[PDB]
Structure formats: C-alpha cells, structure tokens
Design a protein around this ligand. Structure first.
Ligand SMILES: NC(=O)c1ccc[n+]([C@@H]2O[C@H](COP(=O)([O-])OP(=O)(O)OC[C@H]3O[C@@H](n4cnc5c(N)ncnc54)[C@H](OP(=O)(O)O)[C@@H]3O)[C@@H](O)[C@H]2O)c1
Ligand SMILES: NC(=O)c1ccc[n+]([C@@H]2O[C@H](COP(=O)([O-])OP(=O)(O)OC[C@H]3O[C@@H](n4cnc5c(N)ncnc54)[C@H](OP(=O)(O)O)[C@@H]3O)[C@@H](O)[C@H]2O)c1
Lengths: 490, 491, 481, 481
C-alpha cells in the first residue's frame, strides 16, 4: 500500500524531467512514512522554466495553435486524468492526507476543469464593434497574456492545480508551476499527463521548491506576465508587492477566507446541519471555502449547533486510504499546530466548545476532530482568523440584516452559504453578502462552468469558467479606420 | 479670451456637500503664468470622511440599490449637463492644463459619449445564468458594484480621463472618492457639481483634492476603499500596488505609462500616416499616455517618412490654448516641462539625431515645447525607452514585419500601438502580435468608449470604458442553488 | 380633460414627410364614443413607397452607416422628447385605446426606458472576435442591421409596444416601416414626429397606417422588407409566417398570443398574490398578451384565495380613462369586446362565475367587469383560449408538478407568474413552465433590460434588451487567412 | 471494398434499431452498385420517434442532466467518431460520392463540432440582471427548446448532421433526424455512435425516408418544438409554411446560396485562383457555400480566369475511394441533370465556356467537370440560379462598389469570399456584402467556433458556435421581487 521507499521526483522544464540535487523529503501526513522526495529548485531553475515557458509561448508552439489543438491536448489530458485517477489520488493522499474517496472525487472535478477549459479554449472570444460608423471598425481581441506563473497550496494540490492550469493553458498561455513543497507529486504527475496529452515542451513547467525561494522568485520574475497565486492572504500580499517591484505582472489571487454559512430557521435544518458539518469538515477544514462561521437564526441556533455536533461526531475520521474515511490528516505540522492553537485560543477567550476541540489520536499522523465553538464574540481570534482547520465558530442572529452584517463582518469574502427555504432571505443574503462563491441550500457544489474567486482580501480575479480562461488573456481593443483620414495638420 | 480676474477658489466635495478648504494649492495657468484657481489641499481626515460618505452612500442603497435605470438617468442627465457646460468645463480645463480650447471642447464630446456609454452599460451590466447544471442545481453569476472606489487621475486629460472612469465606475452602483491631479483639480470639481445637478445622490461622488503623496497615497492605503482606479505613471502605479498589498488588498484598475509604437509600412498611405504620426506624438503636446512616441517605419521609406513627419510637425499650430486654431498647448507642469527638455537633451547627448523641434516655443509666457522628432535612435537610448510624456518622437527603422513587431514590443509598456499599412496581413500581424491594449490600424487615438481601453505589461491592470470598464468595478459572485433533496454527506 | 371637438386628421409618414391621406379610417374613442382621430387608410403603393424610403435610408448609410453614437444620440433625444410629450402622447394613446391616462403615462416611462436601453444597446451591439483560431486564421462574428424592418403592432399597447420594438430595431441601424393597429395609429404617428424632431434621418422610420388586410399583409409579403416585427394574434403571426415563406424569407420576430399562468402557492404572500392576480388579469382591462389569464392556485388556499381575488377584483376602479384614479379603461374594439363577452358567455360550459361576467355601463364606451371563473375544467374555452379581456380562469392544484403541468397545458408560452416564498417551488415552476417572460412574486415588473418573448405559439425571437437589438441584426462570420 | 449486397439499415427510435418495411435502395452515385437499403419510414414511425424524443426530453434523461453529462456523451461521441472515421467515411463516400480524403477530413470537422458542442454544453448560459434594484432581481435563462427536428441534405450528410445534432443535443434538446433519403447511412451510424457514447434512448432518433413523407411530417408535427432544416430554399419555405400551419415551431433554416468570391487585382491571384477553383469544385460544387460567382477585377479578370481554368483542369476527378481524387460524383441523378442543364443553359444564353462544360466519363458514375463561364450577364440563369455543381460564373468589376453590388446581386446571402491584400477592400466587401459566412483571403476555412448561416433567402438562424447551441434554446426572462 504505502511506498517502501519515498518516490524521488524530478522537476519539469521544457518537456525535460530534471533530476534534483537538493530535495524536500515529504512524509505522509497521515502515516508518518516517507512518501516522496521533491527537488528543491533554485531561482536559476525557475529562470530556465520561465525561459522555456517564454520560448514555448513566443514560438507559437501553443498560443499559435488553433484553439482546437489546445482543446485536443486538454481533452486528452482530461482523458488521461480519468485513466490515472487512482494513481493521482494515491499520490495526492500520500502527500496531502485527504481521504482517498475525496481525492478520487476531486479528480472528477479536475477532469471537468480540463474539459471546461478545452471547451473554453474554443469559445474564448473578444468583441467586434461593427456599429462604430462607415469607416471605423472596432474589435476587442483576447490573446493569452503569455508566461503565467502558477503557485498552488497544499490543501487541494491537484484540484486547485486543475482549477487553474487548464484554464490558463486554454488561451495559449504557458505555465511555470510551483506547487506546495509538501504536495508537489501530483503536480509533477500533471506535468507528465500533459506531456502524454501532447502538450508541447515548455508550456507546462514545474519548478518545485519553497515559497521563499521559487515562489518569491516567480512573483518577482521579470518575465512572468501573470501569476496565479492560491494561498494565504499574507503571501498573496507578498505576491502583490513582488508584482509592483518587478514587472507589474498581473495576479490572479485566490487567498484566505472566513466564510459565513448563514442558516435560517426555515431552512431544512437536517440538510443545513449536514452541509455545515461538511462545509467546515471537508478536507479537515483545510479549505479556503470552508464554512468556518456559522451564522444561524437565534430561534434554532442552539438546536442547530447541536445538529451540527451530531453531524460532526459521525464524520468518519481515519486512514485516508480507508474508502470510508471522510476527513483525513492535517497536511502540515505548522497548520496542525495553528489549528490546535486556535482551538486553545477559542477556549481561552471564553468560547464554548460544543464538540471536538482536540486531536484524533491514531498513534500515527495528525488528525483533528471537527470542532464547533459557540458563544463566539466577533472580537475573538477564532471569529476573525482563518483557522484552516475543521473549526466552526457559531454566531446567532435575529434578522436578515444582522445575518448579512455578521456574514460580512470579515476582511475576507471568498465564499458564503445561505440555508433558507425563503427565496427573499436566500436572495437577500446572496445579493448582500460580499462573497465570490455563494451556495444557496448547498455547499461546495458547482463545477468549473462558473468563475470562482473572492471579494475583499480573499483575492483578485476569477478562476474557472470562461472567466478563468479570460483572466489569463489580455484585452486588445483595435480600431481600424477604413475611410481616408481627415488630416489633423493642413 | 479672458482669464479670471482673481483665481477661482474651489471647495472640495464630500457627501453631496461642498467644503471650504483650509489650506489651498494655488494653480496658475501653465499657458499664461497667471493665477487661475485655488484648490483645497485636503487632509487625510477629509479623505476618511469622503470614504465614509462613499461607504455610507454605497451601503445604504442610495445608489447601488437603485435600478440601473436610475443610475442611467443620472449619467444621461450628467451627459446632458456636460453638453450644456462644455464651454465652461473646457475653459477651466484649458486654464489648469494648458491644452487648446478646441481640443478641450472636443474632449468633452468624448466625455459625453462616456457618460452615455456608462448610462447604457448601467442597464446592460449583467452576469450569467447556468441553467444547464442539472435539474437540482441552478447556477448563476452575479455582478455587483465592488463598493467604494478610489479614483486618482492625472493632469494630462483631467476631465476626460475622469469621465473615462467615473461614469463607468458609477454605472454599476459603485461610489467614488476622487483625487484629481493637484494642478488640474478644477474640472473634476466641476464634474462633482454636474453630477449633483444630474441628481447623483450625496456621497456617491466625492472629490478630495490634494497631492498624490498625501491624499492619493492615503487613498491607495485606505482600509475602506474596495477598488482604486489609478491613471498615471507606472512608478506611482507601483506605489498603488504596494499600498493595496499593505492595506486591504483593494483591487486596482491601473492605467499607467506607455512608450507606444506607431508602425508605418511602406505600403501605408504615408501622408495619412505622417499626419497621424505627427498628431500621435503632438496631441496634448505629447502629454498623452497613448501617444505614438516610437515611430517604427519601414527602412525603405524611413527617411521620406521622417521628413514627412517633420513637415507635419513644423505646421502644428503651437500657441495660446484659447486660440481655437491652436493645435497643441502648454506643458501642464514645470516638472514635466523640465523632464521633456531633459529627455531632449539626453536624446542629443546619447547621439540621436534631432530632425525638428528639440526646444521650447517661447511666447514669453507659459511653457511650450516644439514637436520633436529624433532619428538614429538606438533601442538602449533613454528616449527609446523612457516615456518622455512630451511631443518627442523617436524614429526606428525596420525591414521586416517581424522586426517592426520586435521593435514595437521592445518596451516594458504595452498601452497602445498604431500600425499603418494597407496590407491586411501586415496590419493583422502587427495588431495581433504587438503587446498593446489599444490598437489603431490606419488611425490613431480613435474609437469611442464602446470599447475597453487599457494596457499590457507595465502599462496597467484592467480595462476601462466599454461594458468591460463597468464590469471592472464590479465583483463577480457565483451562486449555486441546490433544489430538491440534499444527499447527506454524513450517514 | 377635453375630448377633441373634431377628430384630429393625421397624415402618414414616409421619408420624413407627412403625407395627406386620401381615404381615412375614422376612429372614435372606445371609452367615449366620440370621433377622436382620422387616420390615412394607406395603399400597397404607400407601403411600397415607405419600404423604398426605408430601403434608401438604409442603403445610403444615413442611419446604419452612422456611428452607434449618432443613433444613440437620436434615440436619447427621442427619449427626451417622449418625456416632454408624455402628456400629449398619453392623451392620444387614451383617446384611441381607452386605457387609463395614469397607465398610459406610466407606459410612457417604460417607452423612455426602452429608448434609453436601445440607445445604450446601440453602442454595445457587438459580435465576437475569435483570436484563438491559430496565428494564420483570424475569426470574427459581425453584427449588422438586417436592413428594412417592417413593424406591425397591435392596439392594446400601441405606443408602448411600438417603443418596445422600434428603438431596438433602430439602434442597430435598421430602418423601419411601421403599420400600427388601424384603430390605434395616432401615437405611432406621434412617434414618427418625435423621431423626426429627435433628428432621425428621413426614411428611417416610416408609418404606413391602415388595415392588416391591406398594409400589414403587404408588409409581410414585401419583397424588400428584410425582417418583420409582428406583435399581435398567433393567427396573424402564422399569416406573417406564410407571407415570409411566399415572399423573400424575411425574418420574423413574432410576439403572439398567450394564455399565461399565474401559479399561486399557499406559502406565497397571498395578499400580494391576490393583488397581483387581480392586476395581472385586469391591467389594460385584460387586453394584454402577458396577462395572467389562468390562476393556478394551491387547493389548500384556493377558494380562500379566489375570495381575495374576488375582493380585490371588485375594488378595481373602472371608469373614464381620463380619470387619474381609473385603473381599467375601455375595451379598445367592438370585436374584442364581443369576443370577451362571448367568452364570458361560453364560460357560463359550466364554469362558476365568481365576479364580473358583464359589461360596466357608464352609458358610453365599452367597459367589461374584471371577471373571475372557478370550477374551470382544462377543456373549457375560457380555460384554454386567449380571451384578451379581464377574465380570469381559476384552476386548483395540490403539487408543484400539477401546477407546472397545468401551467404548461397551453399551446402558448408567453408569460408566467409564480407566487411562493419557497425558493424551491419558485425555481421549479420558473424553470419548468415553458414561458418566455416569468415573474416570481411579482407581475409585469421587468424593464427593457431583459429580452421579452414567448415559447411555443406565443412567438419567435425576443424583443427588448440587447437581445432585441441583436434580433434585428444579421450575424456575419468572417474568417481571414 | 464495395458492398457485395446493399447494407440494409434499420431506423433508430428510442435507442432501438427498427427494421424497415418499405425500403429506399441507394446505389453508389460514383459506382452504380447497390450500396444501402434504407427504411422508408412512415409518418407513424416519425410520430413514434417524436414521442420518444418528447419522452426523453420530458423525463429529464437528457435535458435534466448536468451539462457535464451531456458534454461527456458528446466528447465520447467525438472519440467514437475518431475511432470510426474510416467506417463513417466509407459509407459516406458510398452514398454521397464525395472523395474518401474529403469524407475523412469532413469527419475531423465533425469531431471538432462534437467537441465544440460538448464545450458549449457547459458554457450555455443566460444573464443575471443584478442591476435592477435592491427589490428586483432579473434573470435570463436559456433552456433546451425541447424536441428538435433535424432534416439534412445529401451533399454533406455526416458533416451537416454533426454541424447540427451535437449543438442541438448540447442544450438538452432531443432529436428526430431525417437525413437525405439518398444519404442516410452515416446518420444511422451517428445514431449508433451516440448510443455507444451513452446518449440516452430517445434523445437521437433517425427516421429515414423522404422529405415529402417524413420531412413534411416533421415540419408539420404538433410536437416538434423547433426544426433544423438544411436544404433547398424551396423546401425551406415549405418548412416555414408547415411551421405556420402546425405548432409555430422555430426553424433553423440553412438554405440555398449563390455565393460570390470577389477577387481583386491586389489579391494573391494564384492563391485566389486556387481558392476559386476549390470554392466551386469542392464537393463537386454540391455545396451551399460554394463560390459560384467569381467577381473579379476587370484589370486582371481574363488573366485570373485563365489561372482558374488551369486550376480546374488539374483538379483530380475520379473514383472517390482513390485518396488522390479531389472531387467526386454528383450525388443524385436529378442534381446531375440540373447541373448539366444549367451548363446547357449557360451556353444557350450566350455565356462563354472557358473550361469543363461536360461530364467526366468514367463508364460508371455521374461526374461533372469543373466548369467556368465568363461573359456572364446578371440576367443569365447560371448567374442567378443555384446550380449546386462545379459551375463557376465569372463577372468583372472596376470598382469596389461594383464588386459589392454584383456580390449582393442575389436573393441569397449564405456565403461570400473576398480576395485582396488591401485591408480596406477586404473590410469594405466583408462589411457590405450580405452573406452570413465570409472568407477573407480564404474559402471554407472556419471551424465550429463560429456561427454559420445566411442572410436573406439563404436561411434563418445560425448553427455551430455557442450561438448555434443557443439557437435551440428558449430565452426565459425571470423577474423576482
Ligand atoms: N481558492 C482559494 O482561495 C484557496 C485555496 C487553498 C488555499 N488558500 C489559502 O491558503 C492558506 C493556506 O494555504 P498555505 O498555508 O499553503 O498558504 P501559503 O503559505 O500562502 O502557501 C501557498 C503557496 O504559496 C507558496 N509561497 C510561500 N511563500 C511564497 C512567497 N513569498 N512567494 C510566492 N509563493 C510563496 C507556498 O510555497 P511553500 O510550499 O513553500 O509553502 C505554497 O505553494 C489559507 O489562507 C487558505 O485560505 C486559498
Ligand atoms: N490612460 C493612461 O494610461 C494614462 C493617462 C494619463 C497619464 N498616464 C501616465 O501618467 C504619467 C504622467 O502623468 P502624471 O505625471 O500625472 O503621473 P503621476 O505622477 O503618476 O500622477 C498621477 C496621479 O497620481 C497621483 N499620485 C502621485 N503620487 C501618488 C501616490 N503615491 N499615491 C497615489 N496617487 C499618487 C498624482 O497626484 P499629484 O497631483 O500630486 O501628482 C496624480 O493625481 C505618464 O507615465 C503617463 O503615461 C496614464
């Protein structure tokens, strides 16, 4: 089942797998066994990857193709994703700790993303303005912005990769990808999948390594035209600084969240409780769209919190390779400590622990119980800070206005969920809560047809959908004068 | 004809209310060296108040909660008031900026078009429905005004750039805190008056006048401005980006510098191209971010064309901006005047050949600079790379389409580009392969607000005008609704 | 308000010129039975002349060749003149139609919105670029005005429907030949004046007044009308369709009949729904294609709700359309008045009369009481056929599926209304009822931002919104190299 | 390699192959050997297929799926198309006569069409109007129109099918397909491909038979919500009548054409000559987008015509299974006579034959030479009538205005091609010639990213592109208060 020896990966620039010299040793967060050895690349490796990406972009080998040919590769990548689902998921689990059932289901979304991007490759379009007059023809062109840096986090290593890479590639952009050091394997597998899919060399390059070395060099890179960053708001701001200090590269930022899940008394309380438990426990709460702030109508608040407790206590925690396991390991020790500290702060600051609050001790790996706090004052740390763990903070409200104000009482704005059978309540919360991803009587549903992204400090730009493909294009307005010019100078 | 007897002292505009300043910036006509205006130097507390007003006006639904029809009504009425007040706006525009009155008036037409475009866009602003997701899953994408928008504008097209931003920002339901250039604040304050007369609710458009280093920097750093429209130098654009990172991650619509190529092919109408080239670098005395500052001309006609451009530049009517025949006006600021003259000196010092201009035009008053053409420009010279923001054209020769494109693309910028060729393939190749956000084919600086404008690379972020410019100040909200019965995660 | 001492004689409008009639239709106020207007009865030669003017105005670039900015300027100025002339348009609208003056005035607001929307759409009208086809292949999709557009409008919303078509057609650069309903031509000629005063070039908007038999049929058959907007009966729509096949294959934007459901759930705000149901069937005295003709109400509240509708339907102010308090005006034509009364007679097939059932006799004009039938069986005439009067047929249901099946049980599909606070019920009904215009917990509330049109036999194409501007454009794909 | 006995097909209803009772016997138009036996279905068969498509549409088995699931099937079908390329092309060649190389290359476009439709299935979207005020939310939904009839011609049996069916299927529409009786094989093969790709039963039904039996019943059917018709303008008009006389079904019409190819002196004349020869000789001119009217600048007209003559005479005519063969057989005897007649009419009316003008005698099928007439006067039959054969009518011009006026001098408006290195000429012609599919310095080059269709009598609606998927959706405006 688990690797007898950690799998040594290379990094990938210009279609060539490159042996590492220095390596990050990744142990399974769920099993405390060595699983992979990932090259710790240098800035020079990054430069070569950017150079390869630049070459692959400037020589027309990808952007010069018909959308049909880019779609062909992406549709083939999607097919290979299906064929390799189990292998990708196995390595995804090994490095991330998420359940194998979840990882497999994520691959389905990844396949949908590739198909969507393939479709979007063809539908990527600008405008014609044939309405400007007899001698004035206007158009708006879209063209791939060029070399796109892609930095991804460890919580959904492959999925977030597939929620970016295909959409970026679809327009004809080329990619330099730095996955999270702890979860680089499946990104390298995608590099192989893409190569097997017929992606030209240099179009998808993976420079593995640390955020401080490779990532920072990417965000500062003078020849990366745009960077998709998914990760903390803190490092996102560093990306922004780096863009300003380098080449003004565009940034597609997918940052933190402290997402509200607003539950009204007139919701299906059982459904909402399941969704709330799911919303904060999915990926063991290592989820930027996790519903970490329960905002429940006071009349059902205390019952509903308990409904969530019942739901959370039935969540199957265990070996992620158990197909029955529903939430897996905390991916990193730092995040594990962060979550535990936040639970400690929650207790210390006077919040009432309703369930969870501690580790799950399997003697191996790092697991944390789904945790629900109530009696949370908006000023508590667990109320404001992204815990990135299965830690739910519950807030009560009497009115729709209070619900949306609590929901909006955040620096973030990634996601929000509203549970109500009342169309007006649903639409009011949906329309007035500043979140880029909204779920009404659902959570974390919807495929790559729709753009995703955040308001406020949750990021810049949108990903997936046609939007996500357009996000990595530049808009070029073109005005053609066809009549004789009336001269400015006599 | 007649300058103000005493400089007109303006207020600033917060929450529908004109405010007396405490400290004032004294602005003299750059064309006349006469005091013309007196502008409040606002404080950060003023800025905070304006943001608070913009926030209030945004959150209380007085603007964003209206129907688009009501926002369109105000924008359309404002468009009407722009037409009615054209001469007055243009008068103050000329006074603070130095551009010719005829250009200033014609700029107002574009302003009217922008307000109409935005008024129309207000209604057409839309997201998506995904009715194709299955019986039990309904998806939509909403657009909504991002909220409080900071708007920082430069002095070169004070009113026009303002009107190329504010109505599109407003159209979605955003509220605005505006800092115009310190030296050209009047007409932005006039727009506040116009907008109020057009029925714009209080707090929706606020003007906090003052310096970019005080009010502007505080705007870019403001914890409660959700987005900042910045038009100005790439250098200050970078300050905005840092400031966004250091504050609230506000979105930035950046309209930055340019070093825009005008690619002239031998098979173009060379006389038309020469006129457009002369215009492209001389319009607004070259204080124009979309100015065609880099002539990229096919070597076979390069010398003929450069001479054609010189002949065109020599006839550009320089003079008193209130002369309706004046075609280029004063340099707006002394710093920019010195910068332009320095770049002309640097051009000569670096070995470029001056073909015409190269110096001031001395009227004994104000600051005028001759339309200036350099040839023998090497790509590494300062005038080849730095934006001079004056009427200084650098000429480069090419033999091949690829060379023209490589020269045209040889810049950190990517705001604008012009290609002159009757050959559809050359025109399309240059158009598609030169990294500029605004392309003109056999034209220059044409096309109204129907289309988005913006830059590639260091020329900015985002697009302005068109429906795009309205969408740029909206947030995209995906909404998935599950109907039917939830399949429970937990058993 | 004074009615005209002598009927106002109009001209028809060709190539920017007012044209004296030879023969005239004499129109009396349907509300006052006094002559109000005299309208030219034009010929095929007048029609051909207008089409030739519209052709000329289209081919010479005087309108389509302009920048969208200049078309927008005219439409915006037209919108301004509409506001200035609201009272005058509304007066003639009331005189020839019988709708209340208050309603006529509010319709003018929507007309202004339409002109503004059309002005905005003129600039935003766009196709696509396909810059993604490879370095050696560039693709575009151009939109261009289809050319000369015939516009046939009905008498129920003569000015409003005109403004819900004409500016959207004009926005793209199309030229128009308009035949309004013979009985309600005045305000269409007034728009011709408004458009001329707004700077519309000559020949871009031509009004050939007259009968559908002469002018309309000639429009639908015309070898040089590139597209025809028809708003009117499904029957005449089919005649337009036949005429298109038999002539030049002109495109048809058809806005046809309807038998629209208003689905009311017990969990709706029942008082609001009752008001909306009363409004939806009584607005314009039910002479409304988007009228909620079939109340589909949850059995658990059905007769209680029917009572609320009865109570509100009996409180609707019927009277002189010039009374600003009047909420329903006259039936516009005798034929329609007979039809509605006949349908009330047929209904009385055993349907239970709950309110109305008869005319309102103020002594003059033609008024019909807001009428509610219950115990309506799906096979009855009043259940299925469009009455085009203030005649509501009530049906009961227990399940969402039933409501949707009842709602969909029509050859039509113009409009639908669902009343429920339940989001699942609202979306299920909204998504599964085949109607082009849907209202959730509202009725007749959307402005011209959105396209309007029908499913099934309620029409072809959409009007209003940018879609409606696009409907009168041709799509031209362009591939280069 | 030729079939020993004609392949007897069934027709395809509700996922089941159905043995025919009456049969159309199809012989290879290129080889005059029996090739297929195709059910001549009845109107009852068609009713059954419609019922299945109605069933498959209403039970949510296709329209109720996520777009992802329809895309999955479409993408899988695209995969099966690639696997079955040779088999599809083989039967396509047998029944149509086109060269195997072209038939195989057409399948590439078919795959692109399925891929594009799969993509569009996911992107198919309407609008949200979140800008209508705090108390009014507006939406525009798109939804599959329902049961779509699909009637296709014999000139591109598989390609046109794949240029319609997947785009129609993409939205969730179900299909009843009648291919050309003479070329039904590969359409039945698509039904199988779609079944193997997991398409639910009843979503794609093929009722083979005649247009006058099966086709007319489709166009007249009371339960077909929209019909995609590709074929003659005459029959397109019959569909229009049938729609008016039945259920007001929407019509996507892809009708005739008389397409201009405007060649300027400043074009690459050899490139244009090759494109001109191809544009009229592709599919042996049995192509609605064929450039049948050469409109060439007088200054190079005769020089260019000679280049075209030289190009046409090198066009490899022969056995379509020869991979080197460039143009194949005339597909039907009626069309062969028609082409030959028009060549006769061309000579009889005084046009100067420069090349071709007769059959190519292989002792076997029906082949016609690429044919070029010059001195063609606008009143001649070959100038105006669609020949649907490899017969080029050449016209000369001096001015851009002339080229455009000649190009527009047709009742049709399907396609046009302009050849010029001059961007102004290219854009002027492109913008002013009323054709729905335009080629600049190319011919027949766009993939399915773009909509295709005609102006004027060349059809209604657009196909391919997201637009073509949208054409088979209904627009439903929704306003929520
Ligand atoms: N869709 C979303 O919005 C989304 C989804 C997932 C995660 N997140 C957010 O990410 C956070 C948790 O993930 P995390 O702890 O992995 O975040 P993180 O510390 O920001 O790491 C994200 C990625 O950025 C890299 N990185 C680190 N420093 C960098 C620098 N200076 N320049 C460039 N790249 C740099 C990291 O490399 P290393 O491998 O060396 O750390 C990693 O690959 C939460 O705030 C969560 O909400 C966002
Ligand atoms: N559409 C365009 O892309 C466009 C158009 C015009 C100008 N530009 C660019 O602008 C440059 C020349 O114009 P300029 O001299 O006015 O540019 P600038 O120095 O960047 O000034 C632009 C505006 O930014 C303000 N500002 C200055 N420092 C700031 C700071 N730290 N934070 C926030 N705002 C600050 C200025 O205030 P002060 O009034 O105190 O200077 C002024 O209102 C050229 O590079 C040109 O290409 C761009």
């Amino acid at each position: 089942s688990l690797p007898l020896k950690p799998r040594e990966f290379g990094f990938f620039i210009d279609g060539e797998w490159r042996a590492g010299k220095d390596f990050f040793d990744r142990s399974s967060p769920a099993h405390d066994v060595p699983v992979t050895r990932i090259p710790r690349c240098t800035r020079e490796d990054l430069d070569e990857a950017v150079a390869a990406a630049r070459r692959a972009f400037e020589n027309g080998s990808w952007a010069g193709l018909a959308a049909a040919d880019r779609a062909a590769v992406l549709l083939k990548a999607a097919g290979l994703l299906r064929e390799r689902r189990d292998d990708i998921a196995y390595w995804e689990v090994l490095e991330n700790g998420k359940p194998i059932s979840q990882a497999k289901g994520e691959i389905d979304h990844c396949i949908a993303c590739f198909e969507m991007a393939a479709g979007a490759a063809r539908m990527l379009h600008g405008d014609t303005f044939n309405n400007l007059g007899e001698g004035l023809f206007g158009m708006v062109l879209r063209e791939p912005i060029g070399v796109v840096g892609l930095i991804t986090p460890w919580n959904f290593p492959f999925m977030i990769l597939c929620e970016r890479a295909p959409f970026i590639l679809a327009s004809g952009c080329t990619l330099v990808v730095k996955p999270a050091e702890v979860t680089s394997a499946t990104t390298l597998l995608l590099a192989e999948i893409l190569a097997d899919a017929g992606l030209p060399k240099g179009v998808f390059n993976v420079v593995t390594g640390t955020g401080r070395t490779v990532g920072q060099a990417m965000t500062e890179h003078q020849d990366i035209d745009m960077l998709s960053f998914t990760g903390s708001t803190g490092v996102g701001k560093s990306c922004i600084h780096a863009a300003a200090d380098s080449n003004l590269k565009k940034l597609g930022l997918e940052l933190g969240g402290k997402n509200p899940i607003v539950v009204f008394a007139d919701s299906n309380l059982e459904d909402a409780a399941d969704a709330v438990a799911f919303g904060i426990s999915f990926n063991t709460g290592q989820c930027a769209v996790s519903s970490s702030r329960l905002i429940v109508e006071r009349s059902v608040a205390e019952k509903f919190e308990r409904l969530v407790v019942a739901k959370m206590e039935k969540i199957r925690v265990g070996d992620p390779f158990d197909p029955e396991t529903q939430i897996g390991a905390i991916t990193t020790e730092a995040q594990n400590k962060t979550i535990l500290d936040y639970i400690a702060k929650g207790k210390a600051e006077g919040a009432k622990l309703l369930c969870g609050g501690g580790i799950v001790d399997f003697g191996k790996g790092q697991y944390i119980q789904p945790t629900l706090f109530t009696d949370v004052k908006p000023s508590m740390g667990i109320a404001r800070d992204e815990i990135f763990g299965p830690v739910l903070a519950s807030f009560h409200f009497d009115t729709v206005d209070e619900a949306i104000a609590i929901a909006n009482d955040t620096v973030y704005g990634l996601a929000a969920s509203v549970w109500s059978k009342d169309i007006d309540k649903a639409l009011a919360v949906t329309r007035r809560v500043r979140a880029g991803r909204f779920w009404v009587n659902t959570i974390m549903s919807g495929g790559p047809e729709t753009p995703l992204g955040g308001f406020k400090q949750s990021g810049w730009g949108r990903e997936a959908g046609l939007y996500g493909v357009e996000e990595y294009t530049q808009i070029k307005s073109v005005h053609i004068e066809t009549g004789k010019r009336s001269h400015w100078i006599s």
